[PDB]
Design a protein around this ligand. Sequence first.
Ligand SMILES: [Cl-]
Ligand SMILES: [Cl-]
Ligand SMILES: [Cl-]
Lengths: 51, 188
Amino acid sequence: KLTDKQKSRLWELQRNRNFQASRRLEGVEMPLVTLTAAEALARLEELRSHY
Amino acid sequence: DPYLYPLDIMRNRLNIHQQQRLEQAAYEMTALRAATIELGPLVRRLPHLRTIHRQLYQDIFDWAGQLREVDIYQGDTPFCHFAYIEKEGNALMQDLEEEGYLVGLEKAKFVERLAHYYCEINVLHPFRVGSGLAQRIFFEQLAIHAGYQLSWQGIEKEAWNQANQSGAMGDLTALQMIFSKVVSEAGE
Ligand SMILES: [Cl-]
Ligand SMILES: [Cl-]
Ligand SMILES: [Cl-]
C-alpha cells in the first residue's frame, strides 16, 4: 500500500475496526460502525438534534 | 475541576446533566466521528494529534482539540504535569520527526521505536478525556505511512495498562511484546 490512494483505501478499510478495538482497550464494548463517512455525518446531525 | 459544571458532570455541548448519559452519548458520537477521520499527513506533529481529538469530540466538548489544563492520575500515578504538556509534546514530536516518522524500518526496529513513542505519548496524556483514543489513531495512521498496519484486536486491557506502566518506569519489554503482535505489514 505504497501509493497515497492505496494508503487511503487501507485506512478507510480499517479505521472503524480500529476504533472499536481501541475503545475496548478502555474497557468499553461498542458495536462496529459500518457507515460511510457521509452516512456518519448525517447520523451525527440526527443525534445532535436528538440532544 | 474547571471541566465540571459549578456537579457530578462535565460541561458539555449537548446539555446533558447526567454523567452516565454523557458517557454514552460520547461513546456513540466519537465512534461516528472516527468513521469520518481521514489518514492525514506523513508529517505529523502536535497540531495533527490535536486535530484528531478535535474531530472526535467536536460535538461533545467546547474544548475539543485543546490541551489538558488539570492534572490527572491513574490510581496513584500521575500523567505529565499539565503545564509541561506542550513543551514535552513538542519535544517528543521533534524526536519522531528526526526519525522520519519511523519510515523505512524493518519490522523489529519499527516495533521497538513504536513502543517507545507510544509509551512516551501515553504518559503525556495530552487531553482531558480521550487521550488514549486520539493517540492510537495518530499511531494507526503513522503506521500506514510507514508501510505497516496496527490491530488492537485481542489485546487484553489489563495487559495493555500494565505494559504501558512498566514501560513508563523503564522496561518496555511488555509493551514491545504487545506491539510485535499489533504490528503487521501494510495490506497483509
Ligand atoms: Cl440529562
Ligand atoms: Cl469518551
Ligand atoms: Cl502537525
